């Protein structure tokens, strides 16, 4: 209530001195009135912390901030300590929010709370400080200080932009998505160690493009525009090549569609959707194994490799298995299963002859190392009541002489039923985290 009293005292003093003492004594008197009162006010507001500068900003009193900015702008050295205490409160709020002790925090909620704080402070700045440059500089400098306290801060930003880009379920429209990306890059502007930032973003690009599609297909053009306007001739160039591969994949997709329409000498003339990428920008996905391929897909693969080496000549292709998917038509109804280019070989061998075991699939397959078990256990171990590959020796650990069978599982009446055992939790575990660091 003092700020209303001093403002009234100033108003009545200037009115009296300009009317009862015309245009004679107005300047020296008002100067004294502002000086000692504002010095009292500055000491009053900061240390009070009861409707004080910390408190009146914590509860969100828009009028109190507004009337104080218009009062402390008259006397010098007022906005200096005003921003100093505002920065100190932001430091205290930042430390209580960027606190690392304690495991079990949701990273998406952490950025959301941080971004809500940024929006709240921006709203206060616009409503009260009248977009003062000094206040903007102090909060910008402060945001550079309390954010880089952890070496994982760019990593947390990268996963958040991955969470916001994986699906736009929150904010189906585009107007707030544009603002949420603009605030994200503004937060990224006052951040150091940019090398680690994209190194996870590039990993997130691999994680979001090497899995099921239909995430945005349009918002990718927006990210790169923001990266182009933020960075220069750097890892954004790595993101450039990532985009070229998608362009080549679809151009070859329609180009292969025309050639499968021609037929005539088509060996494996079945439904194919083949994608073409470049190794220069996609990071190491895996060891790119060299397992076997079923005969019908083999003819399909032989067409594309022959075709891609004829009309796209000059470059040879390499075969790999730790990528892609398929739709296995099973057969009382005909329900198509799903295999992520992992169980194609094992199930194809079952079609040739049932009653196999671990020895059969490791001796007549040229199968890679332990990664086989993870692909193999995806159908038997840790399965709900939708098992498509059952065994007699029911156990957790994997044996050698154990027979595989098949169950109807009418509960999984889903026509195009899929076994999505992979991508259970995309969480960027430590072993890849340390090596990429």
């Amino acid at each position: 209530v003092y700020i209303k009293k001093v403002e009234a005292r100033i108003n009545e003093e200037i009115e009296r001195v300009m009317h009862c003492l015309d245009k004679s004594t107005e300047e020296p008197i008002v100067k004294v009135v502002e000086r000692e009162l504002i010095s009292k006010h500055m000491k009053t507001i900061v240390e009070m912390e009861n409707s004080g500068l910390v408190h009146m900003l914590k509860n969100g009193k828009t009028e109190d901030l507004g009337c104080m900015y218009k009062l402390f702008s008259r006397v010098p050295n007022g906005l200096k300590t005003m921003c100093e205490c505002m920065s100190s409160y932001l430091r205290e709020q930042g430390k209580a929010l960027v606190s690392e002790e304690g495991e079990g925090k949701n990273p998406v909620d952490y950025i959301q709370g941080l971004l809500d704080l940024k929006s709240r402070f921006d709203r206060f700045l616009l409503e009260s400080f009248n977009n003062d440059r000094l206040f903007k500089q102090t909060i910008a400098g402060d945001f550079e200080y309390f954010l880089n306290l952890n070496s994982r801060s760019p990593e947390y930003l990268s996963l958040f932009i991955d969470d916001k880009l994986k699906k736009g379920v929150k904010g189906l429209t585009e107007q707030e998505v544009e603002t949420i990306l603009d605030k994200a890059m503004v937060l990224f502007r006052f951040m150091q160690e940019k090398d680690v930032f994209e190194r996870y973003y590039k990993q997130h690009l691999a994680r979001r493009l090497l899995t099921n599609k239909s995430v945005s297909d349009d918002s990718e053009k927006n990210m790169i525009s923001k990266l182009k306007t933020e960075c220069g001739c750097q890892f954004t160039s790595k993101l450039e090549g990532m985009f070229r591969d998608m362009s080549i994949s679809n151009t070859t997709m329609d180009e292969f569609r025309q050639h499968l329409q021609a037929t005539g000498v088509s060996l494996g003339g079945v439904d194919l959707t083949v994608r073409v990428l470049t190794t220069g920008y996609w990071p190491t996905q895996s060891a790119t194994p060299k397992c076997n391929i079923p005969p019908a897909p083999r003819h399909a693969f032989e067409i594309f490799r022959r075709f891609y080496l004829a009309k796209h000549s000059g470059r040879q292709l390499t075969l790999q298995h730790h990528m892609g998917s398929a739709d296995l038509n099973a057969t009382t109804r005909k329900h198509i299963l799903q295999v992520s280019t992992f169980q194609m070989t094992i199930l194809m061998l079952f079609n040739n002859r049932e009653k196999y075991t671990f020895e059969e699939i490791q001796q007549e397959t040229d199968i890679p190392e332990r990664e086989l078990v993870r692909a193999l256990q995806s159908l038997a171990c840790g399965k709900p009541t939708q098992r498509v590959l059952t065994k007699e020796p029911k156990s957790k650990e994997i044996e050698n002489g154990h027979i595989f069978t098949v169950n109807d599982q009418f509960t999984s009446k889903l026509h195009r039923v899929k076994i999505q055992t992979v991508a259970a939790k995309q969480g960027e575990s430590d072993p890849e985290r340390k090596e990429t660091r």
Binding site: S214, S219, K221, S225, E240, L414, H415
Partner: protein
């Protein structure tokens, strides 16, 4: 991870997909029943409307095809928001393009134009605009192609500014359509203006087909002025982008690039490895290889003989 989409809806959707091969009569009704039993939008119903559009276009059924496309356009805005919904209609737009009912093509285009405008999805609205712009560009139509460019440029206008940093994708899409357009009339004054406006504000993405066209325009402009290095450096990239894409202009600009490499008095074999053999032993390209081979050996008599021979 997993997520229950729906048990029954997927079943009848694919059951009717087995029925489209089996006398599509009463398969549309079964598809319609799936849509009615879906109620709110429907992911399986989105592909079902896509399949119905594909089936109806086979047996020349346009009236409800576009009416259900309007339902498909509305389905884009709510459930399948960004997703492959643009890939679905791009395939739908390419599938309509199969026939030659160009009146129905642009009725289908124009209905698409206003629907995407509603969702503020002008993001999907330029994609239809550029495909119509490229189609008009191929058939040398400029009456409505210009109107597309003006609307896209107005959408690119940030009120005070006429070009946006984030919308630089549309600047190149506008410029690329304008580049080949003014190539037809040989407008050097506009061609340089397009390239200059391009270079600075465009840079958001080097789309391979568009980037090669932009560089091909720059190489022509630079070599028409006299800058050998700049004219070099443009086809020096246009050949790269064309190779990745596969457009027939791969060899067309390569001939220009090889001549450009000669003009700068370069002492390095341009055919060495990127041309390799498919672009080093192509019949007319191989004739160009003999020229630069004579250029290296300074065989004036042999060079002139090849010039007169070919």
């Amino acid at each position: 991870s997993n997520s229950e989409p729906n048990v029954d809806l997927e079943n009848q959707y694919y059951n009717s997909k087995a029925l489209k091969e089996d006398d599509p009569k009463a398969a549309l009704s079964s598809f319609q029943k799936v849509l009615e039993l879906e109620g709110e939008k429907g992911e399986w119903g989105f592909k079902a409307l896509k399949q119905m559009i594909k089936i109806n276009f086979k047996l020349t059924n346009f009236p409800e095809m576009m009416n259900r496309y309007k339902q498909l356009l509305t389905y884009i805005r709510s459930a399948v928001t960004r997703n492959y919904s643009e890939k679905s209609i791009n395939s739908i737009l390419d599938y309509i393009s199969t026939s030659k009912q160009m009146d129905l093509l642009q009725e289908f285009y124009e209905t698409t134009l206003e629907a995407l405008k509603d969702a503020k999805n002008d993001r999907l609205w330029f994609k239809t605009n550029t495909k119509l712009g490229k189609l008009y560009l191929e058939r040398e139509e400029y009456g409505k192609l210009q109107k597309i460019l003006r609307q896209l440029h107005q959408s690119c206008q940030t009120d005070d500014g006429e070009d946006d940093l984030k919308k630089g994708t549309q600047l190149l899409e506008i410029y690329a359509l304008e580049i080949q357009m003014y190539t037809a009339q040989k407008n050097n004054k506009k061609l340089k203006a397009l390239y200059e406006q391009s270079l600075h504000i465009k840079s958001a993405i080097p789309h391979p087909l568009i980037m090669g066209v932009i560089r091909e325009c720059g190489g022509k402009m630079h070599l028409r002025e006299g800058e050998f290095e700049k004219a070099h450096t443009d086809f020096f990239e246009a050949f790269k982008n064309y190779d990745e894409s596969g457009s027939p202009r791969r060899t067309t600009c390569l001939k220009y690039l090889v001549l450009a490499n000669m003009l700068m008095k370069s002492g390095i074999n341009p055919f060495d490895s990127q041309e390799a053999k498919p672009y080093k032993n192509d019949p007319e390209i191989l004739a160009m290889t003999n020229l630069v081979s004579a250029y290296q050996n300074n065989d004036i008599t042999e060079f002139e003989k090849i010039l007169k021979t070919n």
